[PDB]
């Protein structure tokens, strides 16, 4: 997963 949280 490139963007872990919100970005």
């Amino acid at each position, epitope marked *: 997963s*490139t*963007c*872990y*949280f*919100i*970005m």
Partner: antibody
Amino acid sequence: DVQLQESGPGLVKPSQSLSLTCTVTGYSITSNYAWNWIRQFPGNKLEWMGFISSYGTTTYNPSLKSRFSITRDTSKNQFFLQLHSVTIEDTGTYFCTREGDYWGQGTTLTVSS
Amino acid sequence: DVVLTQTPLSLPVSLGDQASISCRSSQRLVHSNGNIYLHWFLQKPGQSPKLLIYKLSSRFSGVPDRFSGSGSGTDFTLKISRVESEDLGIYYCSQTTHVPYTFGGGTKLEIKR
């Protein structure tokens, strides 16, 4: 202890190329999170430029006219915004962030001849 | 790209009063995983934007319960129940469901006289 600090030239001439450095302390840029670059112009417009994954892969804003790329140096715990052949329209504040949760102070870039 | 439109551009409020900022999206912001990546940031003068609400209604760490995020479809809202002097600055809606990530133009929360 998670902190970010932008650094760069401050003033460049139109057509020159450029690196802005974001030094990260307290957290490793190889852990989970993406690391983002976001610009702000006078008038308050915020513009997301892109990110570099914890695994070194990039994702850019495809709609921008500025020529740029994002790189990193894991051993120095730093990620960079390479601005290529800048124009007067690239003048503004450049923020690094992790994923909008932690941000640096921002760096002012002026492009003038 | 996704266009985010903020209303109003300037919000004159009295300290202690309730305040509400609206954000209109050009697209639905429901991700494949079911989450709505619509967030709210606050930028105080001389500072970087700070995350208040995220994934539509979650309060970020340290953010008081006076701030709440609401919305569905293309209409999203941020409510401040009791405005304090600390709440003054520019409020931005942010969407990160679709790449490129985009922001609204900002809403200035100002004082009434």
